[PDB]
């Protein structure tokens, strides 16, 4: 996933790992660290979230006390507008045949937190879903890719993701497979992508919506996951989106819409490819690229 970012957003800030270089960790100074904190940890770019048996008024009072003085200039108020990150239809292949199993991630560029299409892309991602060899459902799983993965022993695991950022994102999938099951797995995976843009039935999304409904509700099981949602909802949407509102957006999703949104972000797009391990069976970007059109 680090390699995926490194090549998808190659040449930009998003291509960097969160942990940083070895050289940077080696040579970072107390001044550099203190600079980061002063430069970034500023009040308007921070959200004090809470969840539990807490009075909101008591919260803002204790917050009013310990979260401190006003900024003086206009510079310290304004929230920075980050420079855009360029997507690149590209691949990075880190080969190691001694590695037991191979990992492959393939993705197209996402819409960003703001876009309402991010809801549909999550409905679509729910259709394909995910799997690993401990899924008791087995060959009877509703997910077509999962069923084919079981029937033909295509992979140890596969997952679909729609990682959204401020102005961009990464719609794609990742799977773990044996050295000789990679090509067939990638084949079926890209096939289901085309099946999204082309053949998606109302019956499929009626299930997918029910899964996504149960997913967002499961996301708020406890105080920490509610606080995490709240601290992120403000930071990305500018407001809190109640489960009631999410349901309204989701319940309006139909098969005709899933086809359109997927055809918009997936069909005939140059994807980003990250492949690590014993990766001979999977080869040539051009072949992968041709798997992006016509089901």
């Amino acid at each position: 996933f680090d390699y995926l970012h490194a090549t998808a957003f190659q040449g930009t800030a998003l291509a960097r790992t969160v942990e940083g270089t070895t050289e940077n960790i080696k040579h970072l100074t107390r001044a550099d660290l203190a600079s980061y904190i002063d430069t970034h940890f500023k009040a308007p770019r921070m959200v004090l979230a809470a969840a539990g048996g807490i009075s909101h008024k008591e919260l803002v009072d204790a917050a009013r006390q310990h979260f401190s003085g006003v900024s003086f200039t206009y510079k310290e108020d304004a929230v920075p507008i980050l420079p855009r990150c360029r997507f690149t239809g590209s691949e990075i292949r880190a080969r190691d045949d001694a590695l037991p199993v191979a990992h492959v991630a393939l993705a197209v560029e996402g819409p960003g937190w703001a876009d309402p299409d991010n809801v549909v892309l999550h409905v679509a991602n729910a259709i394909i879903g995910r799997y690993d060899r401990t899924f008791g459902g087995g060959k009877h799983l509703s997910s077509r890719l999962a069923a084919l993965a079981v029937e033909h022993k295509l992979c140890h695991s596969f997952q679909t993701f729609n990682t959204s950022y401020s102005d961009t994102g990464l719609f794609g999938f990742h799977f773990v497979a044996d050295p000789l099951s990679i090509d067939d797995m990638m084949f079926c995976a890209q096939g289901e992508w085309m099946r999204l843009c082309t053949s998606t039935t109302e019956s499929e999304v009626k299930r997918a919506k029910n899964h996504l409904r149960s997913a967002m509700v499961a996301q708020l099981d406890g105080t920490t996951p509610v606080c995490e949602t709240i601290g992120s909802h403000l930071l990305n949407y500018g407001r809190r989106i109640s489960l009631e509102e999410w349901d309204s957006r989701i319940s309006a999703v139909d098969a005709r819409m899933v086809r359109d949104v997927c055809s918009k972000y997936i069909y005939d797009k140059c994807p980003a490819l990250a492949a690590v391990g014993p990766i001979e069976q999977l080869l040539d970007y051009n072949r992968i690229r041709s798997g992006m059109y016509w089901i």
Binding site: T88, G89, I92, R93, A94, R95, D96, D97, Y285, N286
Partner: peptide
């Protein structure tokens, strides 16, 4: 049997 080789490439359209 090949180890420790990273390759980078772009789409033909890029």
């Amino acid at each position: 049997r090949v180890r420790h080789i990273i390759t980078y490439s772009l789409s033909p359209f890029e």
